[PDB]
């Protein structure tokens, strides 16, 4: 029975690898959108722009922000998610006695990366501050995806060991 019970542990570990794969697949889009928003804020920071070009960069910035929120909320695998922040942590099976393989969730929603749902710049100084804001958000996002990838690697090694 102790040997037969390990199939559920293997299934839970590979299910966790699948959900972290979905989280990384959304995080690629989140990182590309953060890079585009950084380019938009960094372009709007220039004073030489007229009001029309600044308003156009502002509109693209808000649109990419909404697209980032949508890509964050859409990241889930059969009703569970490590990116939207819906739960602090998932506990995967690792033993016959059911001791958990912790995989802490890393929120990738705008509020979890420091941005608000209504974050935007209104003038060149606010855009210049938003450069550093989007930079810090991109940094924390890359750190979160790196932690998720390390956790998926631990899932794979534990699956081979099981």
């Amino acid at each position: 029975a102790t040997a037969s019970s390990l199939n559920s542990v293997k299934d839970s570990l590979q299910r966790g690898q699948s959900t972290i794969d979905v989280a990384l697949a959304a995080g690629d889009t989140i990182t590309d959108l953060l890079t585009k928003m950084k380019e938009k804020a960094l372009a709007a920071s220039d004073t030489s722009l007229n009001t029309a070009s600044f308003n156009a960069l502002k509109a693209d910035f808000e649109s990419l922000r909404d697209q980032l929120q949508k890509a964050a909320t859409n990241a889930k695998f059969n009703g569970v998610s490590l990116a939207d922040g819906s739960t602090t942590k998932l506990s995967f099976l690792a033993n016959e006695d059911g001791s958990n393989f912790t995989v802490t969730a890393q929120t990738l929603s705008l509020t979890g990366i420091g941005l608000t749902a209504t974050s935007t710049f209104t003038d060149a100084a606010t855009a210049k501050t938003m450069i550093a804001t989007i930079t810090t958000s991109l940094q924390t996002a890359t750190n979160k995806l790196s932690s998720l990838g390390t956790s998926s690697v631990g899932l794979d090694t534990h699956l081979t060991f099981v």
């Binding site: 990384l24 940094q139 890359t142 750190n143 995806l145 790196s146 932690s147 998720l148 990838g149 390390t150």
Partner: protein
């Protein structure tokens, strides 16, 4: 040693074949992506380095 219900040596050969399969899979993925650090699953720190610098 004598056995019809199971044979450990076939299980060991299967483990080695699955290890070779994972090696060939990672290798063909490295070939078709053009990179040795294709994602955070490869190695998270170096990949965060590459993404930030990119």
């Amino acid at each position: 040693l004598n056995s019809i219900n199971t044979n450990p040596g076939a299980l060991l050969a299967l483990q080695n074949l699955n290890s070779t399969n994972t090696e060939l899979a990672a290798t063909q993925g490295r070939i078709n992506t053009g990179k040795k650090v294709a994602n955070a699953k490869d190695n998270g720190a170096i990949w965060s380095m590459a993404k930030m610098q990119s």
